[PDB]
């Protein structure tokens, strides 16, 4: 049902949690998986291996939709920056676009203050 040949794969690589989300060419989701939603908390949450695992899980989930070719959207810097992509490659999706959509502000919005440790 509602099968697709190729779709976008958003990886939200952050300092806290890596998010893997597989969506349509235009922007309609099918299945997502998170490193925190794989059975990992705190120190295990922000991890390349965990990210990889999450990616694998996502791939497993989306295999019902008949996806063959793949494109990946990269958002933010995290521990799972390339590990995630490696995972999906291993899972067997013929990667075409390694898109980077990192949210760099052009000096507008005020950031929060420094963490004094």
């Amino acid at each position: 049902r509602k099968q697709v040949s190729d779709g976008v794969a958003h990886i939200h690589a952050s300092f806290n949690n890596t998010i893997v989300t597989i969506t349509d060419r235009q922007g309609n989701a099918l299945g997502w998986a998170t490193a925190g939603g794989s059975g990992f908390r705190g120190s295990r949450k922000s991890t390349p291996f965990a990210a990889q695992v999450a990616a694998e899980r996502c791939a497993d989930a989306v295999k019902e939709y008949g996806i063959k070719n793949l494109e990946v959207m990269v958002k933010g810097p995290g521990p799972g920056r390339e590990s995630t992509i490696r995972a999906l490659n291993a899972a067997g999706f013929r990667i075409t676009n390694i898109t980077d959509v990192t949210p760099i502000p052009h000096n507008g919005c005020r950031p929060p203050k420094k963490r004094r440790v």
């Binding site: 676009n97 760099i104 502000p105």
Partner: protein
């Protein structure tokens, strides 16, 4: 850094290229800079320090 995969090219190589592109951009560094707000004074001080370091 929007990166496309060429024909007759491995995945690892593509990944490496992407990494290089990222490095060239300095996106991660920018994010780090913007992670927490910097007071202008502090930034200026840092710049001065960097300049000092440059002189060897």
């Amino acid at each position: 850094p929007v990166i496309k995969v060429r024909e007759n090219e491995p995945f690892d190589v593509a990944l490496r290229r992407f990494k290089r592109s990222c490095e060239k951009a300095g996106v991660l560094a920018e994010v780090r800079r913007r992670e927490f707000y910097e007071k202008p004074t502090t930034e200026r001080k840092r710049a001065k320090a960097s300049a000092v370091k440059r002189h060897a």
